[PDB]
Amino acid sequence: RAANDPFTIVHGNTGKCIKPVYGWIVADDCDETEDKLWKWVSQHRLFHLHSQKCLGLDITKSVNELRMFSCDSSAMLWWKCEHHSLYGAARYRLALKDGHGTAISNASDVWKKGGSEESLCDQPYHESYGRPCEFPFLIDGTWHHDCILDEDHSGPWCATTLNYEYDRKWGICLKQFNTQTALSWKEAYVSCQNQGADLLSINSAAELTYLKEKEGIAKIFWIGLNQLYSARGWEWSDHKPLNFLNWDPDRPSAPTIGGSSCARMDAESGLWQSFSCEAQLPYVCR
Amino acid sequence: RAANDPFTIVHGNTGKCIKPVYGWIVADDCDETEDKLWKWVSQHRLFHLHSQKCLGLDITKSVNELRMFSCDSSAMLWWKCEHHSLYGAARYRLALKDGHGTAISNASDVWKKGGSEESLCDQPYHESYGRPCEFPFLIDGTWHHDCILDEDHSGPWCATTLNYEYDRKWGICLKQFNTQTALSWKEAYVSCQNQGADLLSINSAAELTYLKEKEGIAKIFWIGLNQLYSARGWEWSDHKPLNFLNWDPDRPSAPTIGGSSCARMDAESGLWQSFSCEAQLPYVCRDTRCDAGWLPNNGFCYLLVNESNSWDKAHAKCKFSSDLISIHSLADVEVVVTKLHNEDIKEEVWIGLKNINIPTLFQWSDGTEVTLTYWDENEPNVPYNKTPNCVSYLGELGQWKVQSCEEKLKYVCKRKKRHGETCYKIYEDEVPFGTNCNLTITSRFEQEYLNDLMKKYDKSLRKYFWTGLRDVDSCGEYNWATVGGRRRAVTFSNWNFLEPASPGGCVAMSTGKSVGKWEVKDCRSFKALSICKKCPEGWQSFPASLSCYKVFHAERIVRKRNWEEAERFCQALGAHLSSFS
Numbered sequence: 001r002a003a004n005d006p007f008t009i010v011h012g013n014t015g016k017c018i019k020p021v022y023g024w025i026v027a028d029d030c031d032e033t034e035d036k037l038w039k040w041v042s043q044h045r046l047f048h049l050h051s052q053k054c055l056g057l058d059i060t061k062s063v064n065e066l067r068m069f070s071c072d073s074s075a076m077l078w079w080k081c082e083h084h085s086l087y088g089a090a091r092y093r094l095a096l097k098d099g100h101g102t103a104i105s106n107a108s109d110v111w112k113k114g115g116s117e118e119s120l121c122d123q124p125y126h127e128s129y130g131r132p133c134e135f136p137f138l139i140d141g142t143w144h145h146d147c148i149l150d151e152d153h154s155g156p157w158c159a160t161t162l163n164y165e166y167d168r169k170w171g172i173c174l175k176q177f178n179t180q181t182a183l184s185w186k187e188a189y190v191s192c193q194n195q196g197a198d199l200l201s202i203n204s205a206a207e208l209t210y211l212k213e214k215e216g217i218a219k220i221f222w223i224g225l226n227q228l229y230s231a232r233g234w235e236w237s238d239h240k241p242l243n244f245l246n247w248d249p250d251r252p253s254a255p256t257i258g259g260s261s262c263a264r265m266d267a268e269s270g271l272w273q274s275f276s277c278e279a280q281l282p283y284v285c286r
Numbered sequence: 287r288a289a290n291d292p293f294t295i296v297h298g299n300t301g302k303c304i305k306p307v308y309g310w311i312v313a314d315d316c317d318e319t320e321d322k323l324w325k326w327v328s329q330h331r332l333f334h335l336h337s338q339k340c341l342g343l344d345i346t347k348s349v350n351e352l353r354m355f356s357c358d359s360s361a362m363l364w365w366k367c368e369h370h371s372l373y374g375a376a377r378y379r380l381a382l383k384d385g386h387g388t389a390i391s392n393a394s395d396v397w398k399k400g401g402s403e404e405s406l407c408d409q410p411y412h413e414s415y416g417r418p419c420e421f422p423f424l425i426d427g428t429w430h431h432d433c434i435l436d437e438d439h440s441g442p443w444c445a446t447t448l449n450y451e452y453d454r455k456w457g458i459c460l461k462q463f464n465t466q467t468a469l470s471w472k473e474a475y476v477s478c479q480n481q482g483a484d485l486l487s488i489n490s491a492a493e494l495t496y497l498k499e500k501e502g503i504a505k506i507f508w509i510g511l512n513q514l515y516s517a518r519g520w521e522w523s524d525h526k527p528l529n530f531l532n533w534d535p536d537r538p539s540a541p542t543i544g545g546s547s548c549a550r551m552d553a554e555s556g557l558w559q560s561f562s563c564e565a566q567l568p569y570v571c572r573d574t575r576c577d578a579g580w581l582p583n584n585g586f587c588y589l590l591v592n593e594s595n596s597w598d599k600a601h602a603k604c605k606f607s608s609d610l611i612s613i614h615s616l617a618d619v620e621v622v623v624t625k626l627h628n629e630d631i632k633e634e635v636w637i638g639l640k641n642i643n644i645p646t647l648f649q650w651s652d653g654t655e656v657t658l659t660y661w662d663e664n665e666p667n668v669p670y671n672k673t674p675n676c677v678s679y680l681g682e683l684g685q686w687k688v689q690s691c692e693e694k695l696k697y698v699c700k701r702k703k704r705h706g707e708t709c710y711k712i713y714e715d716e717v718p719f720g721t722n723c724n725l726t727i728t729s730r731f732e733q734e735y736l737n738d739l740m741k742k743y744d745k746s747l748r749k750y751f752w753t754g755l756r757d758v759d760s761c762g763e764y765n766w767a768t769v770g771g772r773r774r775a776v777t778f779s780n781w782n783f784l785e786p787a788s789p790g791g792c793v794a795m796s797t798g799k800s801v802g803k804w805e806v807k808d809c810r811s812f813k814a815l816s817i818c819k820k821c822p823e824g825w826q827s828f829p830a831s832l833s834c835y836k837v838f839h840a841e842r843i844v845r846k847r848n849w850e851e852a853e854r855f856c857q858a859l860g861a862h863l864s865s866f867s
Contacts, residue, residue: 043783044783044784059763059764060775060776062763074779076779076781078783078784080784089786090762090764090786090787090788090789090806091762091787091788091789092762105762105789128540128543128544129540129544129545131543131544160543160544161542161543167541169540169543169544184562254414254415254455255453256447257414257417257446257447257455258414258415258417258446258455259415260565260566275565275566276470276564276565276566277565278562278564278565279561279562279563279564279565280546280561280562
């Protein structure tokens, strides 16, 4: 699978790791993962799960103090990866001076993950009509990062907006015919690869004769028939053989120009049109 | 209009322009456009019109020869523009050695166009189901770059494939309901801007009713209603008023998530559905003193009533002997935001807009001057069907929304380029960085106003502007830049997701996609426009200020004297300005 797992950022030279305090960062006191938990969230941001207080840079004076800030504010907070380091606002590295992390923009610093040679940045960010969730979110006056269970919904439920208190539109934490779930085929593919699954692969006619009679399914959906490799005609998500085709007689099926490079299924008659799969439309991934 | 035109590349230092020969480049013999013609074609390639031979880089030996090659081959030919030069294959500049052009990767060479200051790259590339043409193309054994006219078709015709000899799929040279032409809405917009026109702007119900009965038109197409500006709700291609809408009752019309940010028009019943228009689909493009509180603005006065009542009671109260608030310019929004007691951040304001006929068609309660529409991004809140409609100011920016207006709230009503206090002028071309004026911003509403003015002026992408934010110390601190003597604190900052990537330089401002943000680039040489806002003996003194003065009259003196150059004559005695405590 591929999902954002909790981890801890450590320093390479000496055995120091980040420990957040009320408004700052203090010495390591490390090797105990009961409080020191960090995760990646949208806008390329770092979030501490326990303290629920994110870090940022406030450049307003001569020396910008690196303190804690509210994750819902105009703080201009985001961090990115350099070859063996991390840079924040503008070429600002998380410089360490034996006890506190500051921003001096020094080119002698290294950060890795706990007990593993890794740049803590090789894994990209992972995540109402089945829209992708927004992490974090402020509910009941407290911050939350994961789709937590409660007594209101059946299982996990997340927010589908930046401010749930003003919009009030939630969704199911999608970890399978998702009807009325119109997403882009590329977005659908990356979402179902985040879940560890792959797109539908039609191998025999029995699967099609079972799906055509299905009641709880949209009349139009995606299957995954597309050419990710520009030098070959048509493939599936996984490496499945191409023996069963269901092409369309109505459209001339233009190869590259005049038509498009995605397949669109019609289940009322079982037909495959050529179309552009960048718009929002239901699908299914096995 | 915006289309590609043939031109010539000339050297800046030496008066030489490019001239092609059978397989190489020769001396200038310039100032005659009968044979020397060059143009830009796809894959960032340069094409000669007459000789029909393009240039490329064949890296095969120690010294890569810069000869002529066929545009249909594996030559890896493409060229790009650096700040004041041309680089080709791999940082290889078209170096000149007095007659022949080679690739030595030298940093001292300039190239401009014919008789004008330009980097010959400011104009981007311009160009069977109405697909865009492919330039150039090999037909009848010869290369061709434009849709020429022959006796086969009616007018101009081009190719829609890289190899027309193997595909045989042509198309009409599109220079208007283009039925059976499924294109993307962004592609349709860029193609119709290439033609100089704009998307369909529906102003009255007459044009819409005329389009209903149209036979030669697709049942599904785009209109152009989209939000290119992320801080406002919905606009057209040009700057047309938003008074006529035909929204749909079936879908809940999610503002930004759950739905989309595009509109699609259904003509079988006349509805506007929220959707994403990235797929292919057909389209169509064509000094009064006022009484006790009422603040005056160009003759009339405005004032907010401190009563919290419903919509009908507000419509009946001061329509007092007054009329409701009417926005017709940009200064009135500033008057509303500056007043209203810090805007009462968590509250609402009323404004009178009426609509009785179906579908929705907003008209002013007193007048018909619908010019400016400032809606929240993006909550139109247009219901399915309702005779009483109402509009409300929300947010500190003063955006327009549609509430249910069944509760009690306050309102404002009234009684009986340039902006109002300062002008704003923009030039034609600005290659250097601020050699005449430096624009400085202090507040957010000024940013919104300049963005609106730039949207009214600028109409395409690939454009940049200048803002007074830079630093010469190369230390990392960013503040409001000036011509020297600026120490104010930055009160507002609107950056992109990850905009700052350089520890210095001068910022820019784009209006293509992320409109209204301070883009960051290097400040070495970046061509971008900018807008500018338009007693021992003979002594007289008194110790009344603990200082001995020495001043002169204006008649007994030889020339008029002031305190300016006094440091040249009195500093010899330890003297300074007029020191009063």
